[PDB]
Amino acid sequence: MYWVRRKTIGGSGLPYTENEILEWRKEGVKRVLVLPEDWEIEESWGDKDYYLSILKKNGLQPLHIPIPDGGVPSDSQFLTIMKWLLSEKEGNLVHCVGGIGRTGTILASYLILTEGLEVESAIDEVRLVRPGAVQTYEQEMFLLRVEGMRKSWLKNIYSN
Numbered sequence: 001m002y003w004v005r006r007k008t009i010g011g012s013g014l015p016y017t018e019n020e021i022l023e024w025r026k027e028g029v030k031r032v033l034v035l036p037e038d039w040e041i042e043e044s045w046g047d048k049d050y051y052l053s054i055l056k057k058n059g060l061q062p063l064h065i066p067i068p069d070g071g072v073p074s075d076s077q078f079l080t081i082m083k084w085l086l087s088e089k090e091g092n093l094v095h096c097v098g099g100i101g102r103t104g105t106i107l108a109s110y111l112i113l114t115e116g117l118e119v120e121s122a123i124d125e126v127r128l129v130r131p132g133a134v135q136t137y138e139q140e141m142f143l144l145r146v147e148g149m150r151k152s153w154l155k156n157i158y159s160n
């Protein structure tokens with residue numbers, strides 16, 4: 001795992017053992033945004049519900065928002081994601097399978113929204129700690145759209 005903004009938001013790949021989850025907890029992770037689809041989780045953990053129970057067992061509060069590999073959140077998903085990440089700001093981990101593409105896209109989105117960074121600046125800020133973050137054309141196009149609509153996203157996120 002890696003911190004983009006220390007003890008506020010970080011990223012990781014999909015754990016294959018409970019040991020890796022304990023390491024998250026030791027690093028200060030409190031909340032986990034789970035991005036892989038069901039089938040990706042069920043390959044390493046048997047059942048999605050079981051994986052999430054192991055997260056809770058280890059004191060982590062999870063939210064599952066499945067994004068296909070190489071893909072991006074839908075608009076409804078993104079609103080949910082950003083409300084989740086900004087509801088409780090400390091100790092947030094985001095993960096996909098590799099920890100690079102989907103994860104890198106959400107982290108970059110977070111910087112674009114909270115700090116007002118340009119897209120290229122946000123991508124490079126994530127690549128500092130996660131080389132190759134943000135992998136696909138669809139992901140880069142998504143980031144351009146978020147940056148262009150930053151004021152509108154913030155308004156919707158902070159409504160209610």
Ligand code: VO4
Nearest residue numbers: 097098100101102
């Ligand atoms: O599971 V990922 O979006 O690093 O390819």
